[PDB]
Amino acid sequence: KIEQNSEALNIQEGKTATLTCNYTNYSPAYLQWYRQDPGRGPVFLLLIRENEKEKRKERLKVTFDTTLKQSLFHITASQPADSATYLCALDIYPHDMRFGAGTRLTVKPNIQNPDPAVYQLRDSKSSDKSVCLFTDFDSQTNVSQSKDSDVYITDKCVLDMRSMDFKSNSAVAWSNKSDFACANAFNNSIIPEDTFFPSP
Amino acid sequence: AGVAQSPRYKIIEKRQSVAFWCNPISGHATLYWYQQILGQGPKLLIQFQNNGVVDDSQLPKDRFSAERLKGVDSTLKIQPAKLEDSAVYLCASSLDPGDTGELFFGEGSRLTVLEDLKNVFPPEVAVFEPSEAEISHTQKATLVCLATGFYPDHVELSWWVNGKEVHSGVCTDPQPLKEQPALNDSRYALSSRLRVSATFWQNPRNHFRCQVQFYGLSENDEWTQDRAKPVTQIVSAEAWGRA
Amino acid sequence: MIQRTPKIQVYSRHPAENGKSNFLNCYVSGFHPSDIEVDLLKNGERIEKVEHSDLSFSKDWSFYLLYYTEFTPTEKDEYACRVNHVTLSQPKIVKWDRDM
Amino acid sequence: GSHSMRYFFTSVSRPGRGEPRFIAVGYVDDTQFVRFDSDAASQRMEPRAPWIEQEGPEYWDGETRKVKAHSQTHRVDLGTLRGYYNQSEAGSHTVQRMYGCDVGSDWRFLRGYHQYAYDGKDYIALKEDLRSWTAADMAAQTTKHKWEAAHVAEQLRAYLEGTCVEWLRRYLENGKETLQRTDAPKTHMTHHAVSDHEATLRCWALSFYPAEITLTWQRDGEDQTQDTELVETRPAGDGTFQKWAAVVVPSGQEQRYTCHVQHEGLPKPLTLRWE
Amino acid sequence: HMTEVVRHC
């Protein structure tokens, strides 16, 4: 008797997300789907009975197959704001609501026009580190950790500049060795070939 | 209007006690305690219907205990806490399972159980001004904030432009990275980005501040390292516009 | 909260014949609630190896049990069923009659 | 003959003595075939008829998990009804539940039923059309609303009209030895002189199955119903049943009275005079 | 084979 979700999905903007939830050795009469963000707190979404099939709200499309022992959850016209982990939950009589694990969704943004670059940020007068910033590339590019033990590199991340309908990727690398520099700190990654490196 | 949970974050050593309080949605008869480990989904601990117990066969009565007494709010105790108990502890209240059987979860109570409090140290914050080489290529200016050398992973980072909190144009790392990634009691580091227009950054009356809230120890815990008690505090770093 | 007093029938399973082994039944029915004492009696004393049926109920929620034990009726022996319920002030004693 | 499978659940609270005692028992027609007893050792649903030991562990695990579900529902419901009725947790209270399904001679579904009771009186019950409830009290309305909101009726019907009558067919087919038999009564009449004036005519029917039987007296041919006695059908112990009917008569008129026995194990009714 | 459909009050 178990409850299997997916395993780490991600899609592009606009494309619709499909999350699956299969259960074995059960019989529910009620399915529920939840959205939990990093920072804790599941928040309820949809709720589908066994005799119904397909229930829609906004961009949410959920299905409950009694005989297949499976529920399918659909976010249509997916937004990057929709990126979080999504929980399946069954209702076993009398009132045992059991949860599956997470399927973590990440809706990568439609980078309109790429602009790959690695900028050097002015040192803080109060820390020893030097920080380079890799920004404005399309989501195809992947960012790897550094092979140096004393060089830190954070995974890429989205930037909703809401005011002017702008999203952009970015990833940060900092280290305090004197022989460390921007021109190749992200050189353990497949950088876009036309990536601009400024001049002092 | 909300399911209340205390405390936001709580650090305790092994063999200690800890109690989480939860107040449910007004009028909900059914209250649940759930445990959520790092990556898994919520697993039920104990479940009340009014002041009585529906399901607690899953509740390890070696250490855990909980009761609703009044049939309203309830508390969940751990005497004593094992190191395997570090997790999120969720409270939820629901009405009758049916067309309106949705569950209502609180913000969660993040428990962290440690070997010894010797490693709990607050973060250091510093911001780095936008690249003067970027502002001339694009028409935007991005700041970066670094929350370095803190432990445990109890940090909330926020950006404040001109006294008001900001969200538009912000990324913060979904998860922190360690500074000695193989070390066992390793110390953490986090990063964040605030992007605005160039014309905005170039206006000197404009004040930018990156704020990291750290959740450390209560006063009941005792610090005898003589090296400044690492308690729940706030560490910020600032910058003004530069024409 | 309703209470109803029991319906005791004391009888043998097979048509009783002296000297030949049989079964003594005490059919307790119609009562409510379920907590009820039922002992079987040889002459005066209480028989020990007396087992009963499982608790079930009629359409009107009245309960019914069947207590029973192996026995061999003699000419000079007298059997009876003793029942105490919450609705009886004094415990009722129905004796066993062969042709009834 | 028609057939029916029923399940009877009883749950009696015990203040200060721990968890409430729970007992569930199942019948096919008049033959009991499963039971559960919360005070018993196994904590597991037992068989009580040879033709049900035929089942593998896939089944016995189930009826044990399911019966433990019923058990922990009645466990909460007692505390629920105690609050519904504003009673103290000092008196012992009793929850009962009953459901099953009937079939015709063609073993097709005929009618279902599910119904609840608190402390010996009606509480709630599925309507005969299996699509809505009848609450017997103001308190039971709260239950009704709760269960209307969860579509419980649409799901007990699904069990009642479907799964229930299928397994009844399985049960009848597995135990065609026992459940489909028809043991006819071994009838006779005894005569006990009360005084010099009256005499008791007792008309017996022993060792029969199933137990729906009809005893009647007829003076001069048309039904006699005054001065009669009629004991409730009683279990023999061997899985058969016993029942008698008496009538008190004036001396000399014994032959005017005739006892009539009707059973599904009888072609045409038996008739007995005194001799 | 009893039901699985048991709910609270």
Side-chain angles (χ1 to χ4, degrees), chain A residues 1-68 70-97 99-124 126-146 148-149 151-161 163-176 178-200, chain B residues 1-14 16-81 83-225 227-243, chain C residues 1-48 50-75 77-89 91-100, chain D residues 1-16 18-275, chain E:
Chain A
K1 243 200 245 144
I2 38 180
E3 292 224 354
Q4 299 161 251
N5 232 336
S6 282
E7 68 279 3
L9 297 177
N10 54 37
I11 67 190
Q12 198 92 332
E13 269 188 274
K15 305 308 154 194
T16 85
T18 296
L19 305 189
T20 67
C21 170
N22 305 262
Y23 58 98
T24 69
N25 271 351
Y26 271 133
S27 38
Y30 272 104
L31 259 282
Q32 301 191 356
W33 283 89
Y34 291 79
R35 170 204 209 258
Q36 194 181 17
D37 304 276
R40 300 130 38 239
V43 306
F44 160 82
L45 282 165
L46 283 200
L47 174 148
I48 182 150
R49 202 187 4 254
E50 38 118 49
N51 64 6
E52 281 176 331
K53 200 156 266 167
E54 208 150 322
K55 206 155 133 150
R56 334 226 214 165
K57 161 127 262 144
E58 275 147 17
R59 306 170 300 165
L60 301 188
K61 197 167 132 92
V62 82
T63 63
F64 190 11
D65 200 340
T66 39
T67 76
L68 249 171
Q70 183 203 47
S71 165
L72 300 133
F73 183 76
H74 299 293
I75 312 167
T76 69
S78 85
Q79 230 166 320
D82 288 321
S83 51
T85 87
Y86 288 84
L87 285 143
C88 188
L90 264 68
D91 165 25
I92 318 105
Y93 297 94
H95 203 316
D96 211 12
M97 261 268 194
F99 275 73
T103 293
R104 189 193 145 183
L105 186 51
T106 42
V107 170
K108 272 139 58 183
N110 271 351
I111 277 299
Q112 267 168 234
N113 44 256
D115 192 6
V118 169
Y119 301 118
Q120 186 164 35
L121 269 50
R122 146 182 181 116
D123 304 329
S124 174
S126 308
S127 83
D128 55 325
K129 293 136 189 304
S130 294
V131 179
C132 311
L133 169 64
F134 183 29
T135 172
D136 296 8
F137 46 82
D138 71 5
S139 310
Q140 272 47 35
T141 303
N142 280 5
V143 161
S144 307
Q145 308 102 295
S146 183
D148 272 86
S149 203
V151 178
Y152 306 96
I153 290 186
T154 57
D155 188 49
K156 83 161 159 300
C157 187
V158 200
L159 208 46
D160 210 1
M161 260 182 95
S163 310
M164 33 188 293
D165 183 67
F166 184 73
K167 286 162 254 72
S168 51
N169 286 285
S170 35
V172 159
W174 68 89
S175 183
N176 54 68
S178 55
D179 56 300
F180 162 97
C182 296
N184 53 359
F186 279 96
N187 63 347
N188 186 271
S189 288
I190 312 303
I191 314 307
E193 150 180 345
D194 56 326
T195 292
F196 164 56
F197 290 63
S199 180
Chain B
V3 182
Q5 283 207 238
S6 298
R8 273 281 159 282
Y9 300 82
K10 179 48 164 169
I11 296 172
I12 54 102
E13 195 174 284
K14 184 128 194 185
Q16 276 226 331
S17 280
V18 54
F20 312 95
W21 166 77
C22 157
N23 180 57
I25 290 289
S26 201
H28 282 191
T30 313
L31 180 123
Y32 323 95
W33 286 98
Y34 278 81
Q35 192 213 36
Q36 188 184 29
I37 309 269
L38 188 269
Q40 306 161 29
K43 262 71 196 316
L44 170 131
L45 278 181
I46 184 173
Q47 163 168 330
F48 304 104
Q49 173 76 22
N50 287 320
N51 55 16
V53 232
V54 170
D55 186 321
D56 68 329
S57 77
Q58 301 296 306
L59 196 276
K61 296 185 176 71
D62 324 313
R63 311 158 266 133
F64 297 99
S65 71
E67 201 68 18
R68 218 154 169 237
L69 307 164
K70 282 275 211 168
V72 194
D73 50 353
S74 179
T75 311
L76 174 94
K77 245 200 68 175
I78 307 169
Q79 37 158 38
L83 222 63
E84 63 177 37
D85 286 351
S86 310
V88 190
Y89 288 77
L90 301 177
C91 191
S93 56
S94 112
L95 247 96
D96 332 315
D99 299 13
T100 60
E102 53 201 275
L103 259 63
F104 280 86
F105 279 91
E107 228 67 47
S109 211
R110 163 89 174 271
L111 184 54
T112 282
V113 186
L114 302 159
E115 216 94 63
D116 254 324
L117 285 300
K118 60 181 181 295
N119 250 32
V120 188
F121 280 119
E124 292 164 65
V125 180
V127 316
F128 304 69
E129 297 188 348
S131 154
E132 310 290 321
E134 152 186 312
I135 46 83
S136 34
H137 187 142
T138 84
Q139 310 100 351
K140 297 165 250 280
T142 167
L143 291 76
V144 160
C145 181
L146 258 53
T148 60
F150 62 85
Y151 182 86
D153 184 10
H154 292 172
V155 282
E156 309 212 39
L157 183 148
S158 36
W159 276 91
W160 304 63
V161 170
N162 280 119
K164 256 198 205 203
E165 199 184 338
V166 75
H167 296 117
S168 169
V170 160
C171 158
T172 300
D173 287 344
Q175 285 273 122
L177 41 65
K178 336 187 203 296
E179 303 197 291
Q180 276 89 344
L183 250 173
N184 211 73
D185 40 354
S186 160
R187 295 189 49 174
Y188 282 80
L190 191 129
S191 148
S192 180
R193 312 142 195 63
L194 168 67
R195 192 143 177 185
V196 297
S197 56
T199 87
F200 189 153
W201 169 249
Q202 290 166 336
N203 184 80
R205 296 286 96 66
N206 273 126
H207 173 249
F208 306 76
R209 159 182 95 102
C210 168
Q211 167 191 307
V212 172
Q213 176 104 40
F214 179 79
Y215 295 73
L217 321 164
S218 54
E219 70 283 307
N220 290 27
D221 313 352
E222 309 184 332
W223 182 252
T224 37
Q225 223 84 350
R227 308 146 176 237
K229 178 149 124 141
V231 277
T232 301
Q233 63 186 268
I234 282 193
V235 198
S236 313
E238 326 188 323
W240 293 78
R242 214 145 301 258
Chain C
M1 169 183 93
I2 315 302
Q3 290 177 356
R4 328 175 81 76
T5 195
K7 292 172 196 182
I8 310 162
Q9 288 228 67
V10 201
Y11 58 105
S12 51
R13 170 191 303 186
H14 302 284
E17 170 150 89
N18 290 69
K20 320 206 150 220
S21 199
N22 203 338
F23 265 106
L24 183 71
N25 298 98
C26 182
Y27 179 58
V28 198
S29 55
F31 58 96
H32 193 289
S34 36
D35 258 336
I36 192 176
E37 285 208 5
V38 178
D39 303 300
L40 290 195
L41 309 184
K42 168 144 139 163
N43 307 315
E45 263 211 336
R46 163 199 189 263
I47 323 185
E48 301 258 2
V50 168
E51 44 186 337
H52 55 77
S53 69
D54 295 301
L55 180 61
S56 182
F57 49 76
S58 320
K59 208 100 199 182
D60 68 345
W61 320 107
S62 85
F63 291 115
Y64 61 99
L65 288 185
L66 172 49
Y67 291 70
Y68 62 110
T69 181
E70 203 160 340
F71 88 86
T72 298
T74 326
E75 198 128 6
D77 274 335
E78 278 171 32
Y79 293 94
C81 179
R82 196 246 323 278
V83 166
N84 176 70
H85 191 209
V86 81
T87 69
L88 305 178
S89 57
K92 203 187 265 167
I93 288 191
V94 182
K95 290 181 81 183
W96 172 57
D97 183 332
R98 311 215 182 186
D99 289 345
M100 149 176 127
Chain D
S2 54
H3 301 295
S4 39
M5 164 176 116
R6 317 151 202 164
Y7 277 108
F8 306 97
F9 302 78
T10 299
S11 202
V12 162
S13 58
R14 296 178 294 207
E19 265 203 3
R21 162 150 210 167
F22 177 79
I23 291 189
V25 300
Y27 285 65
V28 165
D29 292 339
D30 294 348
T31 310
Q32 182 207 359
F33 74 97
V34 283
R35 59 149 253 185
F36 180 94
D37 194 337
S38 74
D39 292 349
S42 40
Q43 293 309 92
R44 176 144 180 302
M45 176 85 86
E46 310 168 15
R48 284 251 131 75
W51 54 268
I52 202 69
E53 305 157 353
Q54 299 193 3
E55 303 297 334
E58 291 179 351
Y59 160 99
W60 289 106
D61 285 22
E63 274 45 42
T64 285
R65 181 232 317 142
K66 300 140 97 89
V67 80
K68 283 176 179 165
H70 297 56
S71 174
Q72 310 265 0
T73 293
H74 297 181
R75 214 253 301 154
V76 187
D77 283 356
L78 301 153
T80 290
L81 306 183
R82 167 180 63 82
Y84 277 8
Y85 287 91
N86 243 323
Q87 322 179 316
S88 161
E89 52 287 75
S92 178
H93 293 307
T94 299
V95 155
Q96 317 181 34
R97 160 185 250 136
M98 190 278 267
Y99 60 81
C101 54
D102 306 350
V103 300
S105 322
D106 49 0
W107 295 16
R108 314 263 97 175
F109 168 83
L110 202 89
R111 95 177 195 95
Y113 26 86
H114 172 291
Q115 60 204 171
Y116 213 100
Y118 185 31
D119 259 341
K121 64 210 177 47
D122 286 57
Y123 181 84
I124 202 157
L126 200 61
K127 252 202 273 270
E128 210 141 7
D129 60 50
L130 322 189
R131 282 183 161 76
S132 200
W133 305 101
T134 289
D137 270 294
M138 251 313 296
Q141 307 274 357
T142 313
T143 291
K144 196 167 153 167
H145 291 12
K146 288 224 173 358
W147 290 359
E148 289 177 6
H151 297 53
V152 166
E154 170 168 1
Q155 354 198 116
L156 268 180
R157 206 210 298 140
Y159 167 82
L160 284 202
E161 272 174 356
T163 319
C164 182
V165 305
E166 297 179 332
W167 280 88
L168 178 57
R169 288 194 260 277
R170 164 157 194 181
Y171 287 157
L172 295 149
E173 220 166 4
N174 274 338
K176 175 184 189 309
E177 295 282 298
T178 285
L179 317 170
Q180 280 193 249
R181 80 178 185 278
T182 306
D183 283 325
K186 291 181 193 216
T187 75
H188 70 281
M189 203 184 274
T190 76
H191 165 270
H192 305 295
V194 180
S195 41
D196 302 277
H197 312 324
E198 304 154 79
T200 320
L201 278 202
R202 190 152 279 113
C203 172
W204 289 85
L206 270 69
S207 153
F208 53 85
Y209 180 101
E212 183 65 13
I213 186 167
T214 304
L215 280 171
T216 41
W217 283 110
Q218 288 188 359
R219 179 249 288 291
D220 274 330
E222 201 159 78
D223 295 58
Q224 172 87 9
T225 175
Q226 199 178 108
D227 297 284
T228 54
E229 199 172 1
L230 187 52
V231 283
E232 169 193 350
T233 302
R234 63 197 195 190
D238 59 9
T240 67
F241 294 97
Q242 313 171 348
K243 168 150 208 170
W244 56 259
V247 63
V248 173
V249 309
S251 290
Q253 328 196 348
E254 286 94 351
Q255 53 287 324
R256 310 218 294 165
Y257 304 81
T258 53
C259 173
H260 294 242
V261 174
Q262 319 162 46
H263 198 199
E264 192 64 53
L266 281 199
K268 61 160 184 190
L270 263 170
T271 303
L272 311 157
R273 259 158 202 128
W274 177 233
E275 283 218 356
Chain E
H1 202 243
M2 60 206 179
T3 182
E4 273 245 18
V5 166
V6 9
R7 281 244 209 232
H8 278 158
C9 283

Short mmCIF file of all heavy atoms in Angstrom, two decimals, chain B residues 4-31, unseen atoms left out:
data_model
loop_
_atom_site.label_atom_id
_atom_site.label_comp_id
_atom_site.label_asym_id
_atom_site.label_seq_id
_atom_site.Cartn_x
_atom_site.Cartn_y
_atom_site.Cartn_z
N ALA B 4 -2.20 29.26 13.40
CA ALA B 4 -1.07 29.85 14.09
C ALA B 4 -0.16 28.75 14.64
O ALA B 4 -0.64 27.73 15.15
CB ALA B 4 -1.54 30.76 15.23
N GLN B 5 1.14 28.97 14.51
CA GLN B 5 2.13 27.97 14.91
C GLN B 5 3.33 28.66 15.53
O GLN B 5 3.82 29.67 15.01
CB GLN B 5 2.54 27.12 13.71
CG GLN B 5 1.50 26.08 13.37
CD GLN B 5 2.07 24.86 12.68
OE1 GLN B 5 1.66 24.52 11.57
NE2 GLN B 5 3.01 24.19 13.33
N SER B 6 3.80 28.11 16.65
CA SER B 6 4.90 28.65 17.43
C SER B 6 5.88 27.55 17.80
O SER B 6 5.46 26.46 18.22
CB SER B 6 4.40 29.35 18.70
OG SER B 6 3.56 30.45 18.40
N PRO B 7 7.19 27.79 17.66
CA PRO B 7 7.77 29.02 17.12
C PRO B 7 8.10 28.88 15.64
O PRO B 7 8.08 27.76 15.12
CB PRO B 7 9.07 29.19 17.94
CG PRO B 7 9.19 27.92 18.79
CD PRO B 7 8.23 26.92 18.22
N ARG B 8 8.38 30.00 14.96
CA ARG B 8 8.84 29.95 13.57
C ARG B 8 9.96 28.93 13.43
O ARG B 8 9.90 28.02 12.59
CB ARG B 8 9.32 31.33 13.12
CG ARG B 8 8.26 32.27 12.57
CD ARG B 8 7.90 31.95 11.13
NE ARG B 8 6.59 32.49 10.76
CZ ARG B 8 5.42 31.96 11.09
NH1 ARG B 8 5.37 30.84 11.80
NH2 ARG B 8 4.30 32.54 10.71
N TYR B 9 10.99 29.06 14.27
CA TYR B 9 12.16 28.20 14.25
C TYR B 9 12.58 27.95 15.70
O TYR B 9 12.41 28.81 16.56
CB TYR B 9 13.32 28.84 13.47
CG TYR B 9 13.00 29.14 12.02
CD1 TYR B 9 12.31 30.29 11.66
CD2 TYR B 9 13.38 28.27 11.01
CE1 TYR B 9 12.01 30.56 10.34
CE2 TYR B 9 13.08 28.53 9.68
CZ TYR B 9 12.40 29.68 9.35
OH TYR B 9 12.10 29.96 8.04
N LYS B 10 13.13 26.76 15.95
CA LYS B 10 13.55 26.41 17.31
C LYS B 10 14.77 25.51 17.24
O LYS B 10 14.74 24.46 16.60
CB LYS B 10 12.42 25.70 18.07
CG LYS B 10 12.78 25.26 19.48
CD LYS B 10 13.45 26.38 20.28
CE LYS B 10 13.45 26.06 21.77
NZ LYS B 10 14.32 26.99 22.54
N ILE B 11 15.84 25.92 17.92
CA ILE B 11 17.06 25.14 18.03
C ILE B 11 17.11 24.51 19.42
O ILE B 11 16.95 25.21 20.43
CB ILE B 11 18.30 26.01 17.80
CG1 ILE B 11 18.31 26.57 16.38
CG2 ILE B 11 19.55 25.21 18.07
CD1 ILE B 11 19.39 27.60 16.14
N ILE B 12 17.34 23.20 19.48
CA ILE B 12 17.56 22.51 20.74
C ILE B 12 18.64 21.45 20.56
O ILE B 12 18.83 20.91 19.47
CB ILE B 12 16.27 21.87 21.31
CG1 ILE B 12 15.63 20.96 20.26
CG2 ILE B 12 15.30 22.93 21.81
CD1 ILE B 12 15.88 19.51 20.52
N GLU B 13 19.35 21.17 21.65
CA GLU B 13 20.36 20.13 21.70
C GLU B 13 19.69 18.76 21.85
O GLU B 13 18.49 18.66 22.12
CB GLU B 13 21.34 20.42 22.84
CG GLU B 13 22.66 19.65 22.82
CD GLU B 13 23.60 20.12 23.91
OE1 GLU B 13 24.20 21.20 23.75
OE2 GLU B 13 23.75 19.40 24.92
N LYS B 14 20.49 17.71 21.72
CA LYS B 14 19.96 16.37 21.91
C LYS B 14 19.56 16.18 23.37
O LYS B 14 20.05 16.86 24.27
CB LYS B 14 21.00 15.32 21.50
CG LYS B 14 20.51 13.86 21.57
CD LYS B 14 20.76 13.10 20.27
CE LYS B 14 19.98 11.79 20.24
NZ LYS B 14 20.28 10.95 19.05
N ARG B 15 18.62 15.26 23.59
CA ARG B 15 18.02 14.91 24.88
C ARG B 15 17.18 16.04 25.47
O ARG B 15 16.67 15.88 26.58
CB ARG B 15 19.07 14.52 25.93
CG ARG B 15 20.21 13.65 25.43
CD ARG B 15 21.37 13.67 26.41
N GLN B 16 17.00 17.16 24.77
CA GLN B 16 16.24 18.26 25.32
C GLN B 16 14.74 18.05 25.07
O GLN B 16 14.31 17.06 24.48
CB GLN B 16 16.71 19.59 24.72
CG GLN B 16 17.92 20.18 25.42
CD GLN B 16 17.75 21.66 25.71
OE1 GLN B 16 17.04 22.37 25.00
NE2 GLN B 16 18.39 22.13 26.77
N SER B 17 13.95 19.01 25.53
CA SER B 17 12.52 19.04 25.29
C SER B 17 12.17 20.23 24.40
O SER B 17 12.88 21.23 24.37
CB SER B 17 11.72 19.12 26.59
OG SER B 17 11.61 17.84 27.20
N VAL B 18 11.06 20.10 23.68
CA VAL B 18 10.56 21.17 22.84
C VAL B 18 9.06 20.95 22.67
O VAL B 18 8.59 19.82 22.56
CB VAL B 18 11.30 21.21 21.48
CG1 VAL B 18 11.23 19.85 20.79
CG2 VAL B 18 10.73 22.31 20.59
N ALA B 19 8.31 22.05 22.66
CA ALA B 19 6.87 21.98 22.55
C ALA B 19 6.41 23.00 21.53
O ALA B 19 6.80 24.17 21.59
CB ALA B 19 6.20 22.25 23.90
N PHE B 20 5.58 22.56 20.59
CA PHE B 20 5.06 23.41 19.54
C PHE B 20 3.59 23.66 19.81
O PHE B 20 2.84 22.71 20.07
CB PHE B 20 5.25 22.76 18.16
CG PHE B 20 6.63 22.22 17.94
CD1 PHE B 20 6.90 20.88 18.19
CD2 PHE B 20 7.65 23.04 17.52
CE1 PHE B 20 8.17 20.38 18.00
CE2 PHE B 20 8.92 22.53 17.32
CZ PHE B 20 9.18 21.20 17.57
N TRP B 21 3.17 24.91 19.73
CA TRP B 21 1.78 25.28 19.95
C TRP B 21 1.13 25.61 18.61
O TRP B 21 1.78 26.18 17.73
CB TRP B 21 1.66 26.47 20.90
CG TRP B 21 0.29 27.10 20.91
CD1 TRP B 21 -0.82 26.63 21.54
CD2 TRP B 21 -0.10 28.31 20.25
NE1 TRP B 21 -1.89 27.47 21.31
CE2 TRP B 21 -1.47 28.51 20.52
CE3 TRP B 21 0.57 29.24 19.45
CZ2 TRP B 21 -2.17 29.61 20.04
CZ3 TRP B 21 -0.13 30.33 18.96
CH2 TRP B 21 -1.49 30.50 19.26
N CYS B 22 -0.13 25.24 18.48
CA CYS B 22 -0.88 25.49 17.26
C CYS B 22 -2.32 25.83 17.60
O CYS B 22 -2.96 25.15 18.40
CB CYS B 22 -0.86 24.27 16.33
SG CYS B 22 -2.24 24.24 15.16
N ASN B 23 -2.84 26.86 16.94
CA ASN B 23 -4.23 27.26 17.07
C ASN B 23 -4.88 27.11 15.71
O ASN B 23 -4.39 27.69 14.73
CB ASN B 23 -4.35 28.69 17.59
CG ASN B 23 -5.78 29.14 17.74
OD1 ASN B 23 -6.57 28.52 18.45
ND2 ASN B 23 -6.13 30.24 17.08
N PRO B 24 -5.96 26.35 15.58
CA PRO B 24 -6.50 26.04 14.25
C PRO B 24 -7.43 27.10 13.72
O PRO B 24 -7.63 28.15 14.35
CB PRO B 24 -7.24 24.72 14.49
CG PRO B 24 -7.72 24.86 15.90
CD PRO B 24 -6.60 25.53 16.63
N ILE B 25 -8.03 26.84 12.56
CA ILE B 25 -9.06 27.72 12.03
C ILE B 25 -10.26 27.67 12.96
O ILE B 25 -10.68 26.59 13.39
CB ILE B 25 -9.43 27.32 10.59
CG1 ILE B 25 -8.29 27.63 9.63
CG2 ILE B 25 -10.70 28.04 10.15
CD1 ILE B 25 -8.08 29.11 9.38
N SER B 26 -10.80 28.84 13.29
CA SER B 26 -11.93 28.93 14.21
C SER B 26 -13.08 28.04 13.77
O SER B 26 -13.64 28.21 12.68
CB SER B 26 -12.40 30.38 14.31
OG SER B 26 -13.13 30.58 15.51
N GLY B 27 -13.44 27.10 14.63
CA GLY B 27 -14.57 26.23 14.42
C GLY B 27 -14.26 24.89 13.78
O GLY B 27 -15.19 24.10 13.56
N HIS B 28 -12.99 24.61 13.47
CA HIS B 28 -12.64 23.33 12.86
C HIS B 28 -12.53 22.27 13.95
O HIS B 28 -11.78 22.43 14.92
CB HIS B 28 -11.33 23.46 12.09
CG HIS B 28 -11.48 24.12 10.76
ND1 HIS B 28 -10.48 24.14 9.81
CD2 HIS B 28 -12.52 24.80 10.21
CE1 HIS B 28 -10.89 24.79 8.74
NE2 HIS B 28 -12.13 25.20 8.96
N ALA B 29 -13.28 21.18 13.79
CA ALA B 29 -13.29 20.13 14.80
C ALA B 29 -12.07 19.21 14.71
O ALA B 29 -11.66 18.64 15.72
CB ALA B 29 -14.57 19.30 14.69
N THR B 30 -11.49 19.07 13.52
CA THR B 30 -10.44 18.08 13.28
C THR B 30 -9.11 18.80 13.16
O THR B 30 -8.97 19.71 12.34
CB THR B 30 -10.74 17.29 12.01
OG1 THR B 30 -12.11 16.85 12.02
CG2 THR B 30 -9.83 16.07 11.91
N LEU B 31 -8.14 18.40 13.98
CA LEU B 31 -6.80 18.96 13.96
C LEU B 31 -5.78 17.85 13.77
O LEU B 31 -5.91 16.77 14.35
CB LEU B 31 -6.51 19.74 15.25
CG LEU B 31 -5.13 20.40 15.38
CD1 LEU B 31 -5.27 21.89 15.63
CD2 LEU B 31 -4.32 19.74 16.49
#
